[PDB]
Amino acid sequence: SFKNAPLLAPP
Amino acid sequence: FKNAPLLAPP
Amino acid sequence: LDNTIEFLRGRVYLGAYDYTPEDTDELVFFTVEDAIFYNSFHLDFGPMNIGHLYRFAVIFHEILNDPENANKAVVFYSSASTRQRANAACMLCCYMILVQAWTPHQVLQPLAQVDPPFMPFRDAGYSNADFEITIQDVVYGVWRAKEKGLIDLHSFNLESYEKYEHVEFGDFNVLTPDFIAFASPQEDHPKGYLATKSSHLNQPFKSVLNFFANNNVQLVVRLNSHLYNKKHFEDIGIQHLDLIFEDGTCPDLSIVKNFVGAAETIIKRGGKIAVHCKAGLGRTGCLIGAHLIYTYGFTANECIGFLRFIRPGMVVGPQQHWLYLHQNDFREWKYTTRISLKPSEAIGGLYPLISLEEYRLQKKKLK
Amino acid sequence: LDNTIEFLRGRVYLGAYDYTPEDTDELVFFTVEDAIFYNSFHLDFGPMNIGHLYRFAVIFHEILNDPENANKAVVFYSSASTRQRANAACMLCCYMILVQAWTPHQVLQPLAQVDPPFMPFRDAGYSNADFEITIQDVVYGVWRAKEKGLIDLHSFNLESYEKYEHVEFGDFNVLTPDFIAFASPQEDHPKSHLNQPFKSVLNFFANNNVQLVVRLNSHLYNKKHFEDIGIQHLDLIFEDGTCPDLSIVKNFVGAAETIIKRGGKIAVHCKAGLGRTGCLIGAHLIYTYGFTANECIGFLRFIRPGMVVGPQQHWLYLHQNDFREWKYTTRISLKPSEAIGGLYPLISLEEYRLQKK
Ligand SMILES: [Zn+2]
Ligand SMILES: [Zn+2]
């Protein structure tokens, strides 16, 4: 799972 | 605290 | 917006509203508070578990990936309840830890010093609360478990997770690659000998036995009074051990050392240990939690947070302060004990923890 | 009854009110918010320190002992802010721990799940907060420190405590029987010139069996003034706001063990005596007494507000197992080390094995 994950990198 | 009141746990 | 915490500037926000906000040209709002529910035992209210988190991540990703939201910030929100705000914040943090590889200090900065504060998490038992864990505890515990290879959201099976939690399928959770926690099976076992091949076991008991047979469970530890005959586990080659202590109490450290040694003996053979008390929460959490601290160096609060993230409600009442007060002991034992070279009848011929001096002596022939 | 927490039925209550409650024939109310104040470095707001707690106890006992209140419950209260409420509740818990010998679970039960919750405590630094300690952490830390003999209200000297906290008298606190934390002295050393805070520090150290001074920050004075009074001076410098390499911590712990074995005190300073100093003293307290990181931070701040700053909190949190278990994985060296001025460093079990064969 979670190849659908958008990139949300820490700031 | 010399005259410290007794406040024992319940 | 104002009642809102920034996680990623212009991209991810966490809000709390007692109304339904309307999407704007720049903002898309969503909540799961009305679809993904914490199933409280008593007055516990969270944190949301790994299955809920998986469901949240699916919903979050669908919104993130909808082209209509391509130039919108996403505002995940709850109602204004300090309990519901804590669940939402904790779940978003656990998402960032487990899906986006953030570290604890990164997910905790947006939450620190929020006014009004989040409600700390309490236990599932019936006494007045006297011990709390925070989002900080849960986040560090989930992150540490991920770093140790105990959680992997990318191979997580939501269908199996949600199925086996149900009473009718055995009320159990695989907690780690080594441990299962479950509620006691129950049966009316016929008292005499019978030559019949027919089964008298109910569906949850058969469900437990089939899963255990297929998932390399090699030891069942029973911590409560007898509600079933152990022969049903022994029939399929699974060792069964009683380490019983009274409901709602904390185990003597002699019980804990026997358990840790028994579990280590099985782990070293490559097997799983399945532990139950009546509910599979309090007494079971004492012993598995002690082993997790012994093995991986969790703090007590982290350990409780991690256990409850997988199986809500574990470690009840005074068992929380007990785990907190003995966590140094459990870590100590890595240095001050060894697995016994002589079996103990107290744990069915498995090897208990013994002192270094005892160990040194066991390698010689006493004269 | 409303917005009010029962500590002892018909006896002790903790309230939070935005109005001034009126005494009745059954109830007497008091707040100390106008008398006992926390001095914030930045956005830290608490917890209240041991001197505050001592003065709260004096006030509390005076009200309890007033004949007019003989048959009344006492309601200690704050305003409704979650920060003021956290300070009041934590101080009342610390009172019960230190004066009335309650245990942590006994003082925490009245506070659990209160709505709205108490504001968790943050550090004294300038970066955005990213680490919090709770009343539960502070209570457990103060209780453990009392159980280990590190806090003793019977011998506590309030006047000495409040005096030496002041910048003009050297900005220091005796933290435990072994340790003092202080801000760096400053001087212009000529190329009788010492200022009042430096002389005050030197006098106190000479009178209170300080045998080692450890400097963690860039030089702001000439160390000869400590050697002039027979005190060993050691630099273990690391940069402001950073966390010390474990090699520094092992050297520090061994130096401190060496002095403590001689019965002496170690005085540690960085620039402010808060962050870097808290890293090293905190590591030693965890090694010695088995505090959790959060308890250690709570105890340190109960004596000296503001200790352990920013990322140092997460550092202490992540290394607490290391420090505790050095009792098993390290030994004090048999050989003195020039890096700590002839004192004995912590070394690994294996090197100690070589030395001992
Ligand atoms: Zn049967
Ligand atoms: Zn000079």
Coordinates of C-alpha atoms in Angstrom, one line a residue, chain C:
Chain C
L1 CA -8.1 30.2 9.2
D2 CA -7.9 31.3 12.8
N3 CA -8.9 28.1 14.7
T4 CA -6.3 26.3 12.7
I5 CA -2.8 24.8 13.1
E6 CA -0.4 24.8 10.1
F7 CA 1.5 21.5 9.4
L8 CA 2.7 22.4 5.9
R9 CA 2.4 26.0 4.8
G10 CA -0.3 26.3 2.1
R11 CA -0.8 22.6 2.0
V12 CA -1.9 20.9 5.3
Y13 CA -3.8 22.4 8.2
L14 CA -5.6 21.1 11.2
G15 CA -8.8 22.8 12.3
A16 CA -11.5 22.5 14.9
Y17 CA -15.0 23.8 14.1
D18 CA -18.4 23.2 15.6
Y19 CA -19.9 23.9 12.2
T20 CA -19.3 22.5 8.7
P21 CA -16.9 24.8 6.8
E22 CA -17.5 25.5 3.2
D23 CA -14.7 24.7 0.7
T24 CA -13.3 27.9 -0.9
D25 CA -11.2 28.5 -4.0
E26 CA -8.1 28.0 -1.8
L27 CA -9.2 25.5 0.9
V28 CA -10.7 22.0 0.9
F29 CA -12.0 20.8 4.3
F30 CA -12.7 17.3 5.5
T31 CA -13.4 15.5 8.7
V32 CA -13.7 11.8 9.6
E33 CA -15.1 12.3 13.0
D34 CA -18.6 11.3 11.7
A35 CA -17.3 8.2 9.9
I36 CA -14.3 6.7 11.7
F37 CA -15.3 6.2 15.3
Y38 CA -13.3 5.3 18.4
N39 CA -15.0 2.3 20.0
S40 CA -14.6 3.2 23.7
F41 CA -14.6 0.6 26.4
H42 CA -15.5 2.9 29.3
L43 CA -14.2 6.5 29.4
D44 CA -11.2 6.0 27.2
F45 CA -11.7 8.1 24.0
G46 CA -8.5 7.5 22.0
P47 CA -6.0 7.5 20.4
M48 CA -7.4 6.2 17.1
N49 CA -5.9 2.9 16.1
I50 CA -3.7 1.8 13.2
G51 CA -6.8 0.6 11.3
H52 CA -8.4 4.0 11.6
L53 CA -5.2 5.6 10.5
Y54 CA -5.1 3.4 7.4
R55 CA -8.7 4.5 6.6
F56 CA -7.8 8.1 7.3
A57 CA -4.8 7.9 4.9
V58 CA -6.9 6.5 2.1
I59 CA -9.4 9.4 2.6
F60 CA -6.6 12.0 2.9
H61 CA -4.9 10.7 -0.3
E62 CA -8.1 10.8 -2.3
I63 CA -8.6 14.5 -1.4
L64 CA -4.9 15.3 -2.0
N65 CA -5.0 13.6 -5.4
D66 CA -8.3 15.0 -6.7
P67 CA -7.4 17.6 -9.4
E68 CA -9.9 20.1 -8.0
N69 CA -7.7 20.4 -4.9
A70 CA -4.5 20.8 -6.9
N71 CA -4.0 24.4 -5.8
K72 CA -5.8 24.2 -2.5
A73 CA -4.6 23.7 1.1
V74 CA -6.3 20.8 2.8
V75 CA -7.8 21.5 6.2
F76 CA -8.4 18.3 8.2
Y77 CA -10.8 19.1 11.1
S78 CA -12.8 17.9 14.0
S79 CA -15.4 19.4 16.3
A80 CA -14.2 21.7 19.2
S81 CA -14.2 18.9 21.7
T82 CA -10.7 18.6 23.4
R83 CA -11.0 14.9 23.1
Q84 CA -12.0 14.8 19.4
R85 CA -9.3 17.5 18.7
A86 CA -6.7 15.2 20.4
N87 CA -7.8 12.2 18.3
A88 CA -7.6 14.2 15.1
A89 CA -4.2 15.7 15.9
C90 CA -2.8 12.4 17.0
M91 CA -4.0 10.7 13.9
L92 CA -2.5 13.4 11.6
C93 CA 0.8 13.1 13.5
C94 CA 0.8 9.3 13.2
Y95 CA 0.1 9.7 9.5
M96 CA 3.1 11.9 9.1
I97 CA 5.3 9.5 11.0
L98 CA 4.2 6.4 9.3
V99 CA 3.5 7.5 5.7
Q100 CA 5.7 10.6 5.2
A101 CA 8.7 9.7 7.4
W102 CA 8.5 12.8 9.6
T103 CA 10.3 12.6 13.0
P104 CA 8.6 13.2 16.3
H105 CA 9.9 16.7 16.8
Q106 CA 8.7 17.6 13.4
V107 CA 5.1 16.5 14.0
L108 CA 5.0 17.8 17.5
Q109 CA 6.1 21.4 16.7
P110 CA 2.7 22.4 15.2
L111 CA 0.8 21.0 18.2
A112 CA 2.9 22.5 21.0
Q113 CA 1.2 25.0 23.3
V114 CA -2.1 25.0 21.4
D115 CA -4.8 26.8 23.4
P116 CA -7.1 25.2 24.5
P117 CA -4.9 22.2 25.0
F118 CA -5.7 18.7 23.8
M119 CA -7.2 16.2 26.2
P120 CA -4.5 13.7 27.4
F121 CA -5.4 10.1 26.8
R122 CA -6.7 8.0 29.7
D123 CA -7.0 4.2 30.3
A124 CA -10.0 1.9 29.6
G125 CA -10.7 0.8 33.2
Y126 CA -13.3 1.7 35.8
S127 CA -11.4 3.6 38.4
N128 CA -11.0 7.4 38.3
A129 CA -8.1 8.2 35.9
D130 CA -4.8 8.8 37.6
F131 CA -2.3 8.4 34.7
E132 CA -2.3 10.1 31.3
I133 CA -0.3 9.7 28.2
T134 CA 0.1 12.5 25.7
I135 CA 0.3 12.8 21.9
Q136 CA 4.0 13.2 22.4
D137 CA 4.1 9.8 24.1
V138 CA 2.0 8.1 21.4
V139 CA 4.0 9.7 18.6
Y140 CA 7.3 8.7 20.0
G141 CA 6.0 5.2 20.7
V142 CA 4.7 4.7 17.2
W143 CA 7.8 6.2 15.6
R144 CA 10.1 4.0 17.7
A145 CA 8.0 0.9 16.8
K146 CA 8.3 1.8 13.2
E147 CA 12.0 2.3 13.5
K148 CA 12.3 -1.1 15.2
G149 CA 10.4 -2.8 12.4
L150 CA 7.3 -3.5 14.5
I151 CA 4.9 -1.5 12.3
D152 CA 4.9 -1.2 8.5
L153 CA 1.8 0.6 7.2
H154 CA 2.8 -0.4 3.6
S155 CA 2.2 -4.1 4.2
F156 CA -0.7 -3.6 6.6
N157 CA -3.8 -5.7 6.0
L158 CA -6.9 -3.6 7.0
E159 CA -9.3 -6.5 6.3
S160 CA -7.5 -8.9 8.5
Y161 CA -6.9 -6.3 11.2
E162 CA -10.6 -5.3 11.4
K163 CA -11.9 -8.9 11.1
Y164 CA -10.0 -10.5 14.0
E165 CA -10.7 -7.6 16.4
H166 CA -14.3 -8.7 16.4
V167 CA -15.5 -10.9 19.3
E168 CA -17.0 -13.4 16.9
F169 CA -13.7 -14.0 15.2
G170 CA -11.6 -14.2 18.4
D171 CA -11.0 -10.5 19.6
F172 CA -7.2 -10.5 18.9
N173 CA -4.5 -8.3 17.4
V174 CA -1.1 -9.3 16.1
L175 CA 0.9 -6.7 18.0
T176 CA 4.4 -7.3 16.7
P177 CA 6.1 -10.0 14.6
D178 CA 6.5 -11.8 18.0
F179 CA 3.3 -11.3 19.9
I180 CA -0.5 -11.6 19.6
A181 CA -2.8 -10.3 22.4
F182 CA -6.2 -11.8 22.6
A183 CA -9.3 -12.2 24.8
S184 CA -9.7 -15.6 26.5
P185 CA -11.5 -18.2 24.4
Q186 CA -14.6 -19.6 26.2
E187 CA -16.2 -23.0 26.0
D188 CA -18.3 -25.5 27.8
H189 CA -15.9 -28.4 27.7
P190 CA -17.5 -31.8 28.3
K191 CA -16.2 -33.2 31.6
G192 CA -15.9 -36.9 30.7
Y193 CA -14.0 -38.7 28.0
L194 CA -15.8 -38.9 24.7
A195 CA -14.8 -40.8 21.6
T196 CA -16.6 -38.4 19.3
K197 CA -14.8 -36.5 16.5
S198 CA -17.4 -33.8 16.5
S199 CA -16.4 -30.3 17.6
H200 CA -18.0 -28.4 20.5
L201 CA -16.0 -25.2 20.0
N202 CA -17.7 -21.9 19.1
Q203 CA -16.8 -19.9 16.1
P204 CA -14.4 -17.4 17.7
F205 CA -12.5 -20.3 19.3
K206 CA -12.2 -22.1 16.0
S207 CA -11.1 -18.8 14.4
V208 CA -8.3 -18.3 17.0
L209 CA -7.2 -21.9 16.5
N210 CA -7.1 -21.7 12.7
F211 CA -5.2 -18.4 12.7
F212 CA -2.7 -19.6 15.4
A213 CA -2.1 -22.8 13.4
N214 CA -1.4 -20.8 10.3
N215 CA 0.7 -18.0 11.8
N216 CA 3.4 -19.8 13.7
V217 CA 2.1 -19.4 17.2
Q218 CA 4.2 -21.7 19.3
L219 CA 3.1 -20.7 22.9
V220 CA -0.1 -19.5 24.4
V221 CA 0.2 -17.8 27.8
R222 CA -3.0 -17.7 29.9
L223 CA -3.2 -15.0 32.6
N224 CA -6.7 -15.4 33.8
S225 CA -8.8 -18.2 35.4
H226 CA -9.7 -21.2 33.2
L227 CA -12.5 -20.5 30.7
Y228 CA -11.5 -23.3 28.3
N229 CA -9.6 -26.5 28.2
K230 CA -5.9 -26.0 27.1
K231 CA -6.0 -29.4 25.3
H232 CA -7.5 -27.5 22.3
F233 CA -4.2 -25.7 21.8
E234 CA -2.1 -28.7 22.7
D235 CA -4.0 -30.7 20.1
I236 CA -2.4 -28.6 17.4
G237 CA 1.1 -28.7 18.8
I238 CA 1.0 -25.3 20.6
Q239 CA 2.5 -25.1 24.0
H240 CA 0.2 -23.8 26.7
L241 CA 1.4 -22.0 29.9
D242 CA -0.5 -20.5 32.8
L243 CA 1.0 -17.4 34.5
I244 CA -2.2 -16.5 36.2
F245 CA -2.7 -13.4 38.4
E246 CA -5.8 -11.7 39.7
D247 CA -7.9 -9.4 37.5
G248 CA -6.9 -5.7 37.9
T249 CA -3.7 -6.4 39.7
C250 CA 0.0 -6.0 38.8
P251 CA 2.1 -9.1 38.4
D252 CA 4.9 -10.0 40.8
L253 CA 8.3 -9.4 39.2
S254 CA 8.8 -13.2 39.5
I255 CA 5.9 -13.6 37.0
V256 CA 7.4 -11.0 34.7
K257 CA 10.8 -12.6 34.7
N258 CA 9.3 -16.0 34.0
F259 CA 7.3 -14.5 31.1
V260 CA 10.2 -12.6 29.6
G261 CA 12.3 -15.8 29.6
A262 CA 9.5 -17.9 28.2
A263 CA 8.9 -15.4 25.4
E264 CA 12.7 -15.1 24.7
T265 CA 12.9 -18.9 24.5
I266 CA 10.2 -19.0 21.8
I267 CA 11.4 -15.9 20.0
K268 CA 14.9 -17.5 19.7
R269 CA 13.2 -20.5 18.0
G270 CA 11.4 -18.1 15.6
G271 CA 7.9 -18.5 17.0
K272 CA 5.1 -16.2 18.1
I273 CA 3.7 -16.0 21.6
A274 CA -0.1 -15.4 22.0
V275 CA -1.0 -13.9 25.4
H276 CA -4.5 -13.6 26.9
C277 CA -6.2 -12.6 30.1
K278 CA -9.9 -12.1 30.3
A279 CA -10.1 -9.2 27.9
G280 CA -6.5 -9.3 26.5
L281 CA -5.9 -5.7 27.7
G282 CA -4.7 -5.1 31.2
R283 CA -2.8 -8.2 32.5
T284 CA -1.7 -9.0 29.0
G285 CA -0.4 -5.5 28.4
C286 CA 1.7 -5.7 31.6
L287 CA 3.7 -8.7 30.4
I288 CA 4.0 -7.9 26.7
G289 CA 4.8 -4.3 27.6
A290 CA 7.5 -5.4 29.9
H291 CA 9.0 -7.5 27.2
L292 CA 8.8 -4.6 24.6
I293 CA 10.6 -2.3 27.1
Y294 CA 13.2 -5.0 27.8
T295 CA 13.8 -5.6 24.1
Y296 CA 13.4 -2.2 22.4
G297 CA 13.9 0.5 25.1
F298 CA 10.5 2.1 24.9
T299 CA 9.6 4.4 27.7
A300 CA 6.6 3.1 29.7
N301 CA 4.4 5.9 28.2
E302 CA 5.6 5.1 24.7
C303 CA 5.0 1.4 25.2
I304 CA 1.4 2.0 26.4
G305 CA 0.9 4.4 23.5
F306 CA 2.1 1.9 21.0
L307 CA 0.2 -1.0 22.4
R308 CA -3.0 1.1 22.4
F309 CA -2.4 2.3 18.8
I310 CA -2.6 -1.4 17.8
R311 CA -5.0 -2.7 20.4
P312 CA -7.0 0.0 22.1
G313 CA -7.4 -0.3 25.9
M314 CA -4.3 -2.2 26.8
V315 CA -2.7 -1.6 30.3
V316 CA -5.4 -0.7 32.8
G317 CA -5.7 1.4 35.9
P318 CA -2.8 0.9 38.4
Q319 CA -0.9 -1.2 35.8
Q320 CA 0.0 2.1 34.1
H321 CA 1.9 3.4 37.2
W322 CA 3.3 -0.1 37.7
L323 CA 4.8 -0.2 34.2
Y324 CA 6.1 3.4 34.7
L325 CA 7.7 2.5 38.0
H326 CA 9.4 -0.7 36.8
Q327 CA 10.5 0.4 33.3
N328 CA 14.1 0.8 34.5
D329 CA 14.1 -2.8 35.9
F330 CA 13.0 -4.2 32.6
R331 CA 15.8 -2.5 30.8
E332 CA 18.2 -3.4 33.6
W333 CA 17.5 -7.1 32.9
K334 CA 19.3 -7.0 29.6
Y335 CA 22.5 -6.6 31.6
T336 CA 21.7 -8.3 35.0
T337 CA 20.0 -11.5 33.8
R338 CA 20.5 -14.2 31.3
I339 CA 18.1 -16.9 29.9
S340 CA 18.4 -19.8 32.2
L341 CA 20.3 -22.9 31.0
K342 CA 18.1 -25.1 33.2
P343 CA 14.4 -25.3 32.5
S344 CA 11.8 -24.3 35.1
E345 CA 8.6 -26.3 35.8
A346 CA 7.0 -22.9 36.5
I347 CA 7.1 -22.1 32.8
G348 CA 6.5 -25.6 31.3
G349 CA 10.2 -26.4 30.7
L350 CA 11.0 -23.0 29.0
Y351 CA 13.9 -21.0 30.4
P352 CA 13.3 -18.2 32.9
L353 CA 15.4 -15.1 33.4
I354 CA 18.1 -15.7 36.1
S355 CA 20.9 -13.7 37.6
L356 CA 24.4 -13.5 36.0
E357 CA 25.8 -15.3 39.1
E358 CA 23.2 -18.1 38.8
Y359 CA 24.0 -18.3 35.1
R360 CA 27.8 -18.6 35.7
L361 CA 27.0 -21.3 38.3
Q362 CA 24.8 -23.3 35.9
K363 CA 27.7 -23.9 33.6
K364 CA 29.5 -25.9 36.3
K365 CA 28.8 -29.2 38.1
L366 CA 28.0 -28.3 41.7
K367 CA 30.3 -30.1 44.2

